[PDB]
Structure 1
Amino acid sequence: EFMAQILPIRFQEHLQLQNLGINPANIGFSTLTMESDKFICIREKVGEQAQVVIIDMNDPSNPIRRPISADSAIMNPASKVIALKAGKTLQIFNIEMKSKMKAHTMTDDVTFWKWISLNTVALVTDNAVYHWSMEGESQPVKMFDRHSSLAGCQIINYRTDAKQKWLLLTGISAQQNRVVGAMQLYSVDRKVSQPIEGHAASFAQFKMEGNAEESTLFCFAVRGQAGGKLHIIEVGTPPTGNQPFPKKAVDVFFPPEAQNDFPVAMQISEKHDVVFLITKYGYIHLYDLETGTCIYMNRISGETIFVTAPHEATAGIIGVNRKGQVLSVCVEEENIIPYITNVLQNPDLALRMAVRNN
């Protein structure tokens, strides 16, 4: 209780989507996308008519709404560009210039897709993953074939390292009354896949003390038969001159009343070298990227948070919950080291954080 009033985080509510004319039935994974902190896109069928709604997070009181039919709609992370699909037909549309950009017809249905950069869409079929540039004439390019361990899964995420050399596909399945995560880590250079049991993950770049060059880290969290675990590992050849990053493995805690909770989302602060982990029940956890030390845990949402993105300005995490609350969490930069000193009583981490300068 000493200094218990000083949190290491700042929680913020940004929006309530039901106050912006969004039907609650459409606030969910199949109909609402948030590919970055810049936009939220919702598909709604008002009467017999399919509509696409775009909320510009910089102008949220003026949603853009159009009678456009699509099975899925994802805004570009940065520009006023949208990808739409209808069956096997994909199109990318330049909203700003009110013009079509690119189109492609697949032979296999796309069951999941996501923007992975300012200019590339990843496409997941039942049997493969493709990357499609929004520029130029190029067709999607196959990156890898799907591993059998993901067969029949609901795909929930796809993401890459910054250099697009380490690719990660995540799915879940219902095995009796358990939700089991299955990941496929693919190395572009080695042309090798590794199946991993995991629920949520991210990549990060991290410059170790004593090294001149960044390490590419892969962090994943799982709740399996052994309970909750978080792993932080370097992937790929360490830059010449670097020492290797020692792999970290730490517990992920669930209270006794939360036996059916599990990880659903992860984002990593570039600036603060902190991992944000969100659970199905609406808990957030913070871990130190370097050591895996658990900094903080709390239940921040009464409803499941079903989509997240980096929150750029604060190097935090932003998300939408099933009632339509748009919320974020970030490090509170002036309070985190007091909290580490006096509540965690971890002066090694207090020092290491100040030395990084944060």
Structure 2
Amino acid sequence: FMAQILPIRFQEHLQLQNLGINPANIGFSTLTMESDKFICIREKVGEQAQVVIIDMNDPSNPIRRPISADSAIMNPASKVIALKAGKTLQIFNIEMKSKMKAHTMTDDVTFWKWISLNTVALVTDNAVYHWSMEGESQPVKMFDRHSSLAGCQIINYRTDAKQKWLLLTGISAQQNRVVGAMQLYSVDRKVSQPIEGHAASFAQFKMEGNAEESTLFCFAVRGQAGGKLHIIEVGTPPTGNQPFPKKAVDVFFPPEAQNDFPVAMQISEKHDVVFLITKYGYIHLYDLETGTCIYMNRISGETIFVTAPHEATAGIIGVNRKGQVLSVCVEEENIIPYITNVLQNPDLALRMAVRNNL
């Protein structure tokens, strides 16, 4: 019953191979998507290093230039790009064709990412730094790396909106298993906590009855107990708030997907829904308040290796290994019908309508 309506809208936005990208460069080491505004690809054509910027508002006109960099990340919003070569980092203003700032690190930066409109996080083998793109400031060390992530491939770093909670995520091969290792750091406490996790995100959520938003930490893991997802408030509730009761739910994997595991998460600011993507190209939806699983489906035939928030729909946008650029968001008009008649969870249907963010 109601087999035809879905709680999500799937969209294809682009096929990068149709825009002249070599499929060999459609991967984590050469293609970045730091927000839904831009895709940046490093390509070696003949002997020439080139960097291609796809403006998602004008994608059929990619800009391609000879630029030598080990890594290239567009600003989430501005026409500004961070470039790295060896231990030397530069931030460049594209629109004004001008160098903004440069810095030479002592240690190699193995992973970097824009964490805000104006700040780029730098991960080295032993520490994490934040670097403002503005003014004269140098990178500032935020914390030292926990031994539990030693030797990991770093896969993500992110913060809460207030930049008081910092999360570093790595994976390692333990025999034939991919084991996720996170470090959660409290700026104010100066304390780290090691956490077995594969994908996470922070979120701000206003509980019924509270005047102030709660800062939530959501992570998903496939460990020895199977797939689990946790939704936890970090630190102490804002003055006047009740605390958010911790939620813990299973994360399902079908029998034919024993080697699947979580790889990405984004949280809808408008809908209070967690989007979880797996290595095999499945998407899951969970309610942020309860952890309730809303929907699961395989949405991509290829691994989706990078994601970002999709701002226009308060959804998730990603790029798969073949170059499909795809998004998923809540279908606002069919979500409650689906919850009512397919999930048959009227409490969730009621709570979503009472939030009234549809």
* TM-score, normalisation: structure 1: 1.00
Give secondary structure in 2 for the equivalent of 1:132.
Answer: strand
CA distance in 2, matches of 1:154, 1:86: 19
CA distance in 1, matches of 2:230, 2:174: 23
1:20 corresponds in structure 2 to 19
CA distance in 2, matches of 1:227, 1:102: 46
CA distance in 1, matches of 2:63, 2:185: 38
CA distance in 1, matches of 2:302, 2:5: 25
Post-superposition CA distance 1:266-313 (Å, at most 9, x none):
000000000000000000000000000000000000000000000000
Q: CA deviation at 1:237?
A: 1.4
Post-superposition CA distance 1:65-106 (Å, at most 9, x none):
110000000000000000000000000000000000000000
1:239 corresponds in structure 2 to 238
CA distance in 1, matches of 2:322, 2:127: 34
Give secondary structure in 2 for the equivalent of 1:350.
Answer: helix
Unaligned runs of 5+ in 1: none
CA distance in 2, matches of 1:201, 1:82: 25
Q: CA deviation at 1:225?
A: 0.2
Post-superposition CA distance 1:182-202 (Å, at most 9, x none):
000000000000000000000
CA distance in 2, matches of 1:287, 1:83: 34
Q: CA deviation at 1:60?
A: 0.2
Give secondary structure in 1 for the equivalent of 2:41.
Answer: strand
CA distance in 2, matches of 1:208, 1:86: 46
1:62 corresponds in structure 2 to 61
CA distance in 2, matches of 1:108, 1:237: 35
CA distance in 1, matches of 2:235, 2:90: 34
Give secondary structure in 1 for the equivalent of 2:256.
Answer: helix
Q: CA deviation at 1:146?
A: 0.1
CA distance in 1, matches of 2:293, 2:3: 16
Post-superposition CA distance 1:318-357 (Å, at most 9, x none):
0000000000000000000000000000000000000000
Give secondary structure in 2 for the equivalent of 1:257.
Answer: coil
Q: CA deviation at 1:150?
A: 0.1
2:354 corresponds in structure 1 to 355
Give secondary structure in 1 for the equivalent of 2:351.
Answer: helix
CA distance in 2, matches of 1:322, 1:199: 19
Matched, 1:224 2:218: no
CA distance in 1, matches of 2:89, 2:63: 21
CA distance in 1, matches of 2:271, 2:11: 18
1:38 corresponds in structure 2 to 37
Post-superposition CA distance 1:105-139 (Å, at most 9, x none):
00000000000000000000000000000000000
CA distance in 1, matches of 2:168, 2:207: 27
Q: CA deviation at 1:169?
A: 0.0
Give secondary structure in 2 for the equivalent of 1:258.
Answer: coil
Q: CA deviation at 1:4?
A: 1.0
Matched, 1:157 2:156: yes
Counting only pairs closer than 5 Å after superposition, residues 298-337 of structure 1 correspond to structure 2 as 298-337=297-336
Give secondary structure in 1 for the equivalent of 2:347.
Answer: helix
Post-superposition CA distance 1:147-201 (Å, at most 9, x none):
0000000000000000000000000000000000000000000000000000000
CA distance in 2, matches of 1:175, 1:201: 21
CA distance in 2, matches of 1:293, 1:196: 22
CA distance in 1, matches of 2:235, 2:163: 12
2:138 corresponds in structure 1 to 139
CA distance in 1, matches of 2:214, 2:289: 11
CA distance in 2, matches of 1:259, 1:174: 15
* TM-score, normalisation: structure 2: 1.00
Give secondary structure in 2 for the equivalent of 1:313.
Answer: helix
CA distance in 1, matches of 2:60, 2:290: 42
CA distance in 2, matches of 1:43, 1:240: 48
Matched, 1:80 2:85: no
2:211 corresponds in structure 1 to 212
Matched, 1:173 2:162: no
CA distance in 1, matches of 2:108, 2:229: 33
Q: CA deviation at 1:236?
A: 1.6
Give secondary structure in 1 for the equivalent of 2:312.
Answer: coil
Post-superposition CA distance 1:245-275 (Å, at most 9, x none):
0000000000000000000000000000000
Give % identity.
100
Give the stretch that moved more between structures: 233-242 or 8-17. 233-242
Q: Which 4+ residue blocks in structure 1 deviate beyond 2 angstroms? A: none
CA distance in 2, matches of 1:10, 1:141: 41
Q: CA deviation at 1:316?
A: 0.2
Give secondary structure in 1 for the equivalent of 2:17.
Answer: helix
